[PDB]
């Protein structure tokens, strides 16, 4: 399959180093221009760097020149972004992408989240939001760092009428969010409602039953 797969993101300290990888499938990078593009959370697309591995020729935004090094190994069909002197400003989903010659970029990777922060990993606290004939219920997922967190309901069995809000950064510098579901009121002692919370960065899986 024609595909790009980024890896190596995660939570890193300010001033530190992080090597991102972009693994190409379905084509060899020798014949393409490979790009790094980043998105600070809620912001637009900023182009960061590009490399033509067949000629070793490199391009950098002034925003990253000297600090960041874009490179490639054609024998590994992989491009790299070596990020150094990392700043809070460099917090972003990092996407790699492919261009042929002077044609426009056509294939993007899924992206890898880089969070630059001196703040420690912290698992969420999960608390119930207890409940015409439609009722609402949910769980508050409170006090976690960093992003992201996943919430599902009834181990993914319940999807209809679910709204997981975007996280908000509270003043303590921890995130918090609510997942909410609108259900029939007839099922408050019939059907049990569990929310499944996965905070992969802290390795915290928490399951909380909510009932009246």
């Amino acid at each position: 399959e024609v595909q790009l797969v980024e890896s190596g993101g995660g939570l890193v300290q300010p001033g530190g180093s992080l090597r991102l990888s972009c693994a190409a499938s379905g084509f060899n990078v020798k014949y393409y221009m490979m790009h790094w593009v980043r998105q600070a959370p809620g912001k637009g697309l900023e182009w960061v760097a590009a490399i033509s591995p067949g000629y070793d020729y490199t391009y950098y935004a002034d925003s990253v020149k000297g600090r960041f090094t874009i490179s490639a190994d054609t024998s590994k069909n992989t491009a790299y972004l070596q990020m150094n002197s990392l700043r809070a400003e460099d917090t972003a989903v990092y996407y790699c992408s492919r261009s042929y010659w002077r044609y426009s970029v056509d294939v993007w990777g899924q992206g890898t989240l880089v969070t630059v922060s001196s703040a420690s990993t912290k698992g969420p606290s999960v608390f119930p939001l207890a409940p015409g004939g439609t009722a609402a219920l949910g769980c508050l997922v409170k006090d976690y760092f960093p992003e992201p967190v996943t919430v599902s309901w009834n181990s993914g069995a319940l999807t209809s009428g679910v709204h997981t809000f975007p996280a908000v950064l509270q003043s303590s510098g921890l995130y918090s969010l609510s997942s909410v579901v609108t259900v029939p009121s007839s099922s408050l002692g019939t059907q049990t409602y569990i929310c499944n919370v996965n905070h992969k960065p802290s390795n915290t899986k928490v399951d909380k039953k909510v009932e009246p």
Binding site: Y59, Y60, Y95
Partner: protein, 212 residues
């Protein structure tokens, strides 16, 4: 460095409508300009390559034209799923710069929010903190005023709002207001109310509880 000045920064259009999105390049970039669609949580998808060529699998609604340094992206008939940020990019010379983006929202019928309030859980209070959550479910348009009153005193700078992305199927929004207090602050007051003002309500809707 070439700037791509993208107009407008945001727009609201009904399903069926024609939508026009503008990129002005600060220098000649020939046809080496492309248009990307980015849905929430996702990587951009290529829509239009080399200024006017429709990319494979992309609906014929999407079109692109060039007038010298001015580039135009057109949706012929919107569709509820076209909710997305659209960006243009120039690949004429490094840095290969992106427009600031255009957020396209789908315009629809006014729909009043369903309002629900959730008191702090026992568990949270034992943790020593009190979070009160007000849900506005399935409303249009986005603009909604949520006020918190404890013992009938209007609060300020102690609530955080979060709002879902527009539903790609029914173009509604949901919103959370979360009031956070000390346990002591929670237990020195009796009455907790969120008061909702929205265009679909004839008058403000208040949902409230007394501790106990």
């Amino acid at each position: 460095d070439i700037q791509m000045t993208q107009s407008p920064s945001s727009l609201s259009a009904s399903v069926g409508d024609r939508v026009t999105i503008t990129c002005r390049a600060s220098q000649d970039v020939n046809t080496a300009v492309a248009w990307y669609q980015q849905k929430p949580g996702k990587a951009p998808k290529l829509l239009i390559y080399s200024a006017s060529f429709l990319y494979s699998g992309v609906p014929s609604r999407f079109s692109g034209s060039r007038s010298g340094t001015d580039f135009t992206l057109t949706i012929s008939s919107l569709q509820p799923e076209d909710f997305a940020t659209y960006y243009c990019q120039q690949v004429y010379s490094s840095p290969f710069t992106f427009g600031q983006g255009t957020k396209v929202e789908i315009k629809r019928t006014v729909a009043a929010p369903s309002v629900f309030i959730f008191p702090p859980s026992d568990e949270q209070l034992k943790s020593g903190t009190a979070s009160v959550v007000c849900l506005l479910n399935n409303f249009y348009p986005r603009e909604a005023k949520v006020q918190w009153k404890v013992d009938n005193a209007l609060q300020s700078g102690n609530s955080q709002e979060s709002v879902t992305e527009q539903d790609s199927k029914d173009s509604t929004y949901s919103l959370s207001s979360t009031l956070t207090l000390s346990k002591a602050d929670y237990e020195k007051h009796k009455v907790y109310a969120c008061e909702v003002t929205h265009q679909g309500l004839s008058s403000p809707v208040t949902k409230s509880f007394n501790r106990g």
